[PDB]
Amino acid sequence: QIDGFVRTLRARPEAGGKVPVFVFHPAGGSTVVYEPLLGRLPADTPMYGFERVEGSIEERAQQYVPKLIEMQGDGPYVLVGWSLGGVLAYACAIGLRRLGKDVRFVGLIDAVRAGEEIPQTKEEIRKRWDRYAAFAEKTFNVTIPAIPYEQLEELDDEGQVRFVLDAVSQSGVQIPAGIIEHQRTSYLDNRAIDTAQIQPYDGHVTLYMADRYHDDAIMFEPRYAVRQPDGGWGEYVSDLEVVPIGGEHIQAIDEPIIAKVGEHMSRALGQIEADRT
């Protein structure tokens, strides 16, 4: 199944064959979310999923890019991601080009920025933190946590999610170990988007643009209620292609919407497979 952090969805032929598609995992999820997408793609299309690793967005691309080079050498590279997955796809695209590699397609599946830019002041930190606590107060019962006022600052990424365990567990609630792990990696991963700096990219990038964020994203950060037509990428990508697919961010990876993604996407993998001559 899984070698290191690389999941095989469809192995590439012993010899020759088409170009593999590299997909990257979403926050709190594995790359089997790309199985519908793979269904809507040309037949013997290889597909390989990059699973979670630790670090900032830049730290994670430094582990992925060597593995990409081991698998695909100089190119051509097809890089596809949904949600956080597209941010990971973009970083790897940057990193591969900086080493002179041939990246010919970057597919962003509604990897869309909050319309207006998210402030990173004290007051907004406190604020988005309450809206995170709000989730834990409805989901795991426990309407009785507490808000810190300077504890938040001094703690790091891990200390912060560790701090919410100490709070919920002393209510008397036993969160199952598997649920704790999942919430923890969802936190670290969404936090790595928080701090990431986008770099400019002069290659082709396709944004598959749904039309709205689902409800619990707006609950955490209401700036996700509005979207720009470019998704926040227009400043950084000269050759940006926006493809409509409608629906909500959470639906974009699924049937039926994924069918519009993969129909277009097959209209590029055909172009690439051609331009291999």
Ligand SMILES: COc1ccc2[nH]c(C(=O)N3CCN(C(=O)C4CCN(c5nc(C)cc(C(=O)NCc6ccccc6)n5)CC4)CC3)cc2c1OC
């Ligand atoms: C120029 O800059 C640009 C340009 C273009 C860009 N595109 C993107 C992009 O592709 N994506 C991926 C899809 N996205 C999400 O899925 C959201 C992620 C946060 N969110 C949430 N929702 C819940 C329910 C929980 C959490 C969470 O736990 N947060 C951690 C945290 C931090 C602090 C306090 C408390 C918790 N987060 C709602 C969904 C948005 C980001 C980014 C980006 C960009 O900036 C880097």
